[PDB]
Amino acid sequence: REFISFPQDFLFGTATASYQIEGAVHEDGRGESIWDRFSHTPGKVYQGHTGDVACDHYHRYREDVALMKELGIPAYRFSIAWPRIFPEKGMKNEAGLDFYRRLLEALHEADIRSFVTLYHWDLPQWLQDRGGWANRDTAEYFAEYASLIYERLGDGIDAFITHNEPWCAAFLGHGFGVHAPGHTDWREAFQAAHHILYSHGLAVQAHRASSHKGQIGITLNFTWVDAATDSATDQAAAEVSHAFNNRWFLEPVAGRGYPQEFQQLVEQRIGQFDFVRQGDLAVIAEPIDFLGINFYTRSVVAANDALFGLRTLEANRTEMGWEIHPDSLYRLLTWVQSVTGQLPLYITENGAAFADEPVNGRVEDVRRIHYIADHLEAAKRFVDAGGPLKGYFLWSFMDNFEWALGYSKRFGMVYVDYESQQRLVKDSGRWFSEQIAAHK
Amino acid sequence: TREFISFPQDFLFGTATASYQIEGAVHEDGRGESIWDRFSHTPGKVYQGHTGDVACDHYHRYREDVALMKELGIPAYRFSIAWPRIFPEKGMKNEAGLDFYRRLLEALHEADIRSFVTLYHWDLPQWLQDRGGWANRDTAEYFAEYASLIYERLGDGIDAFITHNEPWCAAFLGHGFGVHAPGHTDWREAFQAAHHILYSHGLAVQAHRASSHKGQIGITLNFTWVDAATDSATDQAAAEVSHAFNNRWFLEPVAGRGYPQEFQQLVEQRIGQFDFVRQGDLAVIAEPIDFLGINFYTRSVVAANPDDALFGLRTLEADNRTEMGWEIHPDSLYRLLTWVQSVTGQLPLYITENGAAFADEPVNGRVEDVRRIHYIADHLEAAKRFVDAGGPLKGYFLWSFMDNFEWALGYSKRFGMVYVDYESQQRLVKDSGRWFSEQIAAHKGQV
Amino acid sequence: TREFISFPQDFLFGTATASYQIEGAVHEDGRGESIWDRFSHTPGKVYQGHTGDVACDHYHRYREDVALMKELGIPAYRFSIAWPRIFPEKGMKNEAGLDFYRRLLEALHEADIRSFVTLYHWDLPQWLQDRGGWANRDTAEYFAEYASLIYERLGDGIDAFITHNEPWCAAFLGHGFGVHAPGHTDWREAFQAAHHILYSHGLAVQAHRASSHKGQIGITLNFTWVDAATDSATDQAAAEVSHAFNNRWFLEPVAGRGYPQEFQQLVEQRIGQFDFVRQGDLAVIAEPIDFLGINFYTRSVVAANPDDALFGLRTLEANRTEMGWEIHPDSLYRLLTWVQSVTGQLPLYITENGAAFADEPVNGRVEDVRRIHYIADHLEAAKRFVDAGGPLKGYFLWSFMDNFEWALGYSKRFGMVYVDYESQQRLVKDSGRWFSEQIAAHKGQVR
Amino acid sequence: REFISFPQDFLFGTATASYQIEGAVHEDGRGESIWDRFSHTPGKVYQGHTGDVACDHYHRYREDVALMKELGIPAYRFSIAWPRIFPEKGMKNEAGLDFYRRLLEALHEADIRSFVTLYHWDLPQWLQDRGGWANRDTAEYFAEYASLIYERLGDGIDAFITHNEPWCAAFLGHGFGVHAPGHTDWREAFQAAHHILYSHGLAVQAHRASSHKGQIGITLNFTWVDAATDSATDQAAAEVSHAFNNRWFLEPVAGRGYPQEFQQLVEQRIGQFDFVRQGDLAVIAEPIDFLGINFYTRSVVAANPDALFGLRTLEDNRTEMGWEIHPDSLYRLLTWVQSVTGQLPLYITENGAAFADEPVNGRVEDVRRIHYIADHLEAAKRFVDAGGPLKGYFLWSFMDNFEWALGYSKRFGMVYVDYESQQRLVKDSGRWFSEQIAAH
Ligand code: NI
Ligand code: NI
């Protein structure tokens, strides 16, 4: 595939999440997370897969960073594990900070920028024992955990990310139950969504006083919605799913509040939002430096479901079942800019899952090479239209634990043989590296 | 003496009036009683018992007034249609009321003066107020009925339509504070009337898109730029509450963003849940318009006050002010247009009202109202700077064309650029009218 | 200590209450908001912000209150049905509201207490006031709708019906002076509301004559006897003006006659022509009734005053009660005489009579001997009206227990049973026992 | 059936529970409970039944007490609704105490002894938002809520019951998920069981200094277990089921700690109990004044290779709950409980059956319920004839009510309730029990 051209400002990188790659779940005082409890609960993860070992990134980070530098990747988005820092109540763990200190010093010698997510769904179980995100105090514990990372690790970090996909943590974790902690109460799920948004604002406030001289933001994931027909009832359900997946978190960040027509819809099946206190939407909407965009696929939604009356039609698609629709990314970037305007935008997560197979010591994943190129072209058209797209982070650097589906989905440009823990750079990874060098 | 302000090519100047404020002839040709006829004739409600019984008698002198606007060379003219003249009783079309506005529009067409017609300028028919008025959701449908009739029988002579004029006053001054008609004092009824007013606007725009009228339609909202009296955190918060009350409550719903949520939850704490907002009402109110009319007059320096149990605000005294006690602060106009642009974007904007009230006394047969010259010149200056910044300002309507009934203050406030001596009904063009007329010609003859 | 009064055998004693003033529990079982819920929660409208939120909690303690009537031996009991409990919203029949009054009536049935049920004691649903309330003629139709449902669902446990209670206040105090719900101040609207209230009474009687209810139906009016302050020809004229305002405006239309013509044409001079009296409305209002309820408390010595622009009246102050009301028992006799001269031999009932006194319980006992003298005096005056051949058939003491005295809140104690609102405890005053002994004396007299 | 004879000390009564009987959930400040959240969650309670109205005891309590005194019932066991007292965090609601102060004086006027349960599962949702019984703080809020009841209502209460069936609250509410709050985490369930036990000990300590004159205890439910056959693996499974149902709470209350051989099986399936702090079991074992036995049926258990404990229950002689009517199993139960508690006074606080009661021509003849009551009453007499400290028998229930996850489909009461009329029709079992009381 042809290489795609971008301005000099443009920034490339890969993305990982702590619990999906790190492993070493008992090492150096790490406390139990909600995903340790969930994956070890029978019937919750595909084939009972665990994050016990994962990619052993806790021990093989030096090689993985060296693999990044050898390919010349300019940046790296990873996450800091809250349980490694605060294993139990009010107990800082210096072995947790010292690990992430040695990881950042490895990124600096390789001359690799670091975007670090503070919360990527691995909430400590002791906080879950205290109600977790249904409890408003959790939003205040995250601010203190955010403030410590600012002081102890700030110098070696370029950009901070407070939350990754609050839609999943709130609704998949407390509404549908397919994610940790696995609750199925929709009042609790929308209550968690407000406290997550509230916890984001408190961390942005603490960051402005944190003396850290870098950028701060938040990554939201979007699933573009296209009505199944020109019908009024299908165009109606498509607008409901758009507010659910794409508007519920972005607009409060943008200082607009919750989507009002959709909120009165939610309160109708639940009740009045007694968890929205006076001043929360102002704290939630404290100005950030950038917005992280996580796109993967679009949805086609027809009318139907006692909650929102929605039904998505199955998908040319990913092993996740996700249809590969590249311009839906351009349509998404265009709509986001209508709400965000000139604020810098990074694609913090984009990729696909294909049935990767290693033959003759080579992974010939032609499908991902085409996927990366299609969305890179789609990302390029948004740059030509004047959109403030600053970077594109590839998901993922290496195959890892894809949550409820276990290790059955290999999103990585580097093949990981989980029995030998050997990193084998796929053909899609070398193509990305050529895209890096071609840009610079 | 002031220098004239240059504007882009298709900038549209004009003057604005209101039906009940100028027309008079409240009993002629079967006109029904309006809420302002009932309000002004109720003792203690209007300054010295003044009413709009006669006003400027524009119902009889409209040809002289139109020809005076042609002589002065005014390209546009904003006026309102009196709902009682068209539907004097429940479901009764009045042809004589429609015929008058038909005669007026023919005079404007011959004079080559563009027409911007306001469908509701506060004169609700009393028979609708007898049925609950704006507190009743049925009023929004009767407005969509009367709005749809005007599109068909009068749309050909009309360039642009304006659904509502200053919904903030009709809702909160007529149902909350009670200083305007109908004079109610119930804040739940006020915010309920405000929603039904917004609902009637969306219904009227929906009716306009199916009306076969090919001109523009919009809404006129009045704003009051707020400035915190101090950098104090309690004064900054109050100024935010005042900003949401006056400027955000009606614009943001029309702009498809819903009510300001933080301020609405405070309103609900003082009153209760908003049981009058139904599903789909927000989308209806947010029906796309072609332009937004902007009414600006002054600012307000807001300081917090726990004495006010509703919103906790206090407005400081304006020296350098008008006869309404309104501070003359032209920079606030520029800063308001910039914020409206940040909300509306590239939506075309019109200043459908701007002016001042000054103690005008005709000496030697003409009014040397130098102080109004400086008001119009300073704000057109601030208006032009909003254009040079890239703002989509498309016109400017001076309020008013002639002195008229200034609502609760009666005839003791002279906003016009033409003096009206109500004893003889003689119109005397003031110095403001001459300067404003020269500003048109200078804009007309620029290369 | 007073001697008991003798009355004919068929004479019926009882006590009277009203829904909103005693029931409380205004959010429970789907009850809709009434105009008095909205009025009392509006600041400055009721003394010290008192509301009927809790009141006597009769909604929960009705069995204990009925049993207390049984213990004291009260033969009859007058109460009103809260319209919001039956129709909380437009076209929404609430079975829980009908179920409560079903439970209360069966409790009165077991205690052998005849029931007089008032259909409208001022607590109009706010959803009806949102549509104009009594200023809208549609309200009269909805009242005949709600009255017709009470006839069929509850008529079996109801001995007599009372359509309206004191329409003079609901119309003039609610829409003219504004001291009562809905708190409007428009005298055109007040007299318009008074006609629709009279019209709603006629429609409810027509519905009753076809309702299959085998009991009586009537209407309750409040009268204030007026005596001229002097012999001056203007004080005589002013007392005539007040007499027509308070006593004649509703009784005479009900009694087959029309509105008092001389006073009406003065009202029309102050306002305008009565365009709300359609032909046939008088015939509807004058639908024959079975009895007339009489509410009487005081007189009023009236002197002419030029400062009153409306009617030109001045009431002098008054030996009187905590309401500031003179205790003039002979005025009751003169009132019943005048009503008889108008209504003839139509059966008469005193549906309300009592006084407010500063009852303070000492040693667990309220020695309110002043209320003893009040009831005994007026019962004597009522006995004279019987001795003259007057068709007075009953006497209802207002009230059974201390309750929400409307705008004056809980600062006026009219009941014969003291209510401690902190514990909701009921303590029968000395007035309750004397009045109870008056029952047995009438029940035990051999004839 | 002939009336059963008992000593003069013996004390009869009927039992109810707040959420099952009261209704009026929104009235006078009652906060949301975990059973309001659970009932209004779809697919959790049979046919979406709720305790919204229930028996409307909040309004008919005078009628019900008068009906009890008409039948001459010596005692009444009910529960105080925690949400009525503390609707939200740190907010005493005197209206909640006002309802229960009127009910007690109604019983005192009728000369009826009152046994009051402080917790009958209706945990306030604001406490559940803080993690509920998985959070140790809940055990300390319960001690405060218990200490308040002692000072404000102590005079009108003869005996207190701290908890009712902690086995169901812990394991059905947090392990199986069929009861509120509906979690399915087995570590959370045993963690909740310890905090429920811990909350009982704190409430007993608070009572010993409460200045209340009466007695305090705990109500524990038991299901006697007999192995399916003589088989050694059925012998083992019946012992595991025995410790799970009957030993996990009674023995810690008796100062014996958790059943060790069963606990190490539990730690095998989960992990070491990190929630048992030193000194807990000492507080747990605070000496009580009586023990409340809740018996309904036995269980027949055979081995089953169940990944948790390896148990399988088997079941012509069953009620509408599907429970075998085994009167002799009650005697076997009381003998074993006496072997553990010695001469501690024992009250049967709940005992009854659910039969398909049907009213024909204004009266119900539940002759199966008279047989059930008289069967266990004879089994109760055999225990005291052997020297057992059985001092009271409480029938469940006084009237039909909301039977939790089954809604109103099970009528346990001796007074029929037609939930559309709310009329109380005394059952022919209530006929017999009122005469059995009069005979003794
Ligand atoms: Ni004329
Ligand atoms: Ni109640």
Residue numbers in the entry:
A (entry chain C): 3 to 306, 309 to 319, 323 to 447
B (entry chain A): 2 to 319, 322 to 450
C (entry chain B): 2 to 319, 323 to 451
D (entry chain D): 3 to 307, 309 to 318, 322 to 446
From the publication, what sentences describe this entry?
In this work, a novel β‐glucosidase (WP_026963033.1) of the glycosyl hydrolase family 1 (GH1) from the extremophilic organism Alicyclobacillus herbarius (Ahe) has been identified and investigated. β‐Glucosidases (EC 3.2.1.21) constitute a group of enzymes that hydrolyse terminal, non‐reducing glycosyl residues from glycosides. AheGH1 is arranged into a single (β/α)8 barrel fold, common to this family of glycosidases, with negligible main‐chain displacements in peripheral loops and α‐helices.
Crystals of AheGH1 enzyme belonging to the monoclinic space group P21 diffracted at 1.98 Å resolution. The asymmetric unit of AheGH1 contains four independent molecules, with a calculated Matthews coefficient of 2.42 Å3 Da1 (estimated solvent content of 49.31 %). In addition, two nickel cations were identified in the model, present during the affinity chromatography purification step. The metal cations are located at the dimer interfaces between chain A and the symmetry‐related monomer C and between the B and D subunits and are coordinated in a tetrahedral arrangement by the side chains contributed from two histidine (H61) and two glutamate (E29) residues. The molecular weight was determined to be 99.7 KDa by gel filtration, consistent with it being a dimer in solution. Based on comparisons with GH1 members, AheGH1 the main active site residues present are: R79, H122, E167, N166, N296, Y298, E356 and W402. Based on comparisons made with GH1 members in general, E167 and E356 are likely to be the acid‐base catalyst and nucleophile, respectively in the reaction.
